[PDB]
Structure 1
């Protein structure tokens, strides 16, 4: 997830007289040379946005070199990868008996180790681009490295889900905070709308937990995609509209919230009920409205980004025919 961050650092200056001429420009250039494209303080710095504040260029006191140093606090655009994150393009580099290596081709530099034990792996031949999902573990950001260390496997769609029992109302400040995620989802939806609809439908049908019976596209005037199975007589509710109405204090967030596999994970739909009617196989998670909303919004963001990057990477039928081996493997692991 691309985000902002603020760092502190100390930079050494060999020629203080030359540095003091255009201090802000020299500072930006040296910061870009040192920190851009490297992992530092549990994050990977993408760009240097600016310098919030600095210190006067002091002169080093413990040596007679005459050099200087300056403490700089700067805002940088960084990226942080989380567990269960969906990456739609990694290049298989090494395929040996021990492990499998891949490198992401997206704007999030990360090297991914893959265990050969899992059956979904060991099929991705060297040179194939396979969309993978990061495993339930932390992503290692080793200082000084141009990539991130992570573990994961080829993204096989899951068949289970989680139910959130909400006993707390959504406060105005929490809704205002969540409007940022709502804006992110909106921008992702408008970016998706510019892409090819055929590729969108193909990939959503491919990564559906179930199998779409026939061509039937569901439309909400803000998200367009194929329509799949339902849940008896239960109807889904739009999450974006619910959040917008909650900003005006017009809805109640209490009760059982769920996103069972019959819903398209890249769609803003969700199920809200007054009773635990979902046939889940675990105890419902007691949480506030804000926690459930954060989880669902980030899941929607993840799946929207996954579909968008998958369509970006595979822009022609030649790549699809090349990766039909992976596509059939994905298709096989589906519940009837």
Structure 2
């Protein structure tokens, strides 16, 4: 993601006299020179928003240099990349007989180590760009590097899902916290809305779990996308307005919640039931509404960002048709 963070550090001032003339300007300039664009303290710093607190410019005591130092506590906008995250712009750099290295072209500088032992990623072309699914491993943030080290693989849509048994609901504060998530949803959704629908529906249909031959323009007056399969007589529930009404406290969120493969993932809708009619091969996960809401909203964020990045990178037909062997492998694995 892209989020705010607070760091503490110590800066060495070679010439205290010149430095103290414009302390704030010099401090911001030096912090931007040192920390912007590097990995530090399990994060990758993008921007230095400001300095909250700082120390007086002390004079170093243990040597005869007359040089100075200052303790700086500064707030910076950084990026933390999680597991199972979608990156829709990963250009392959190294494809040798041992390992595959690709580089991302997004706001999260990350090198992707793709194991060359799976039929999806075994055959590719150097210079081709491809969306990448991150494995269930922590992203390495080696200090001082210009990039984040993380393993990944070409994103094949999966056939499984999970069911959450929620027995405890939200409070007012626990919903005001998720207000930020729904704000992120609506921002990404406006970003989707400000762009033409042809490639939107193309990518959404191509990354649908099943084969979508029929064309539909399903509308919710807030989210637009192609309609797919249903599940008998079950009708989805929009999690966005669901959480809004739960904050308004005119609805109960208890029960079974699910995000099946046939469901429109990037849409804010999901399944809720009073008893599991889902033919899931995994046991239901007993939990509260905090974990299920945060996971579902994070998944919606991830898929919306994935579609937005796909449409941002691939602008014309040449880009989409240059990599059509990846897309062919994509159709080859859908039901």
TM-score of the superposed pair, with normalisation by structure 1? 0.99
Q: CA deviation at 1:254?
A: 0.3
C-alpha deviations, 1:161-210, integer Å up to 9, x for none? 00000010111111000000000000000001111200000000110001
TM-score of the superposed pair, with normalisation by structure 2? 0.99
Secondary structure of residue in 2 paired with 1:228: coil
Asked whether the 8 Å contact 1:39–1:45 carries over to 2, the reply is yes
Asked whether the 8 Å contact 1:213–1:228 carries over to 2, the reply is no
2: CA distance between counterparts of 1:85 and 1:268? 18
Asked whether the 8 Å contact 1:255–1:274 carries over to 2, the reply is yes
Q: CA deviation at 1:126?
A: 0.2
Asked whether the 8 Å contact 1:124–1:130 carries over to 2, the reply is no
C-alpha deviations, 1:93-124, integer Å up to 9, x for none? 01111111100000100000000001110222
Q: CA deviation at 1:213?
A: 3.1
C-alpha deviations, 1:119-168, integer Å up to 9, x for none? 11022200000100111100000000000000010000011100000010
Q: List runs of 5+ in structure 1 lacking aligned partners.
A: none
1: CA distance between counterparts of 2:123 and 2:323? 11
Asked whether the 8 Å contact 1:167–1:288 carries over to 2, the reply is yes
Q: CA deviation at 1:250?
A: 0.6
Asked whether the 8 Å contact 1:239–1:268 carries over to 2, the reply is yes
Asked whether the 8 Å contact 1:60–1:66 carries over to 2, the reply is yes
* Equivalent residues in 2 for 1:175-194, closer than 5 Å: 175-194=175-194
Secondary structure of residue in 1 paired with 2:21: coil
Asked whether the 8 Å contact 1:114–1:152 carries over to 2, the reply is yes
Asked whether the 8 Å contact 1:95–1:122 carries over to 2, the reply is no
Secondary structure of residue in 1 paired with 2:225: strand
2: CA distance between counterparts of 1:289 and 1:106? 32
C-alpha deviations, 1:43-89, integer Å up to 9, x for none? 00000000000000000000000000000000000000000000000
**Cα RMSD (Å):** 0.6
Equivalent position of 1:131 in the other structure: 131
C-alpha deviations, 1:1-45, integer Å up to 9, x for none? 000000000000000000000000000000000000000000000
Q: CA deviation at 1:320?
A: 1.4
Q: CA deviation at 1:319?
A: 1.1
Q: List runs of 5+ in structure 2 lacking aligned partners.
A: none
Asked whether the 8 Å contact 1:88–1:310 carries over to 2, the reply is yes
C-alpha deviations, 1:212-254, integer Å up to 9, x for none? 1311111111110000000110110001101110111011010
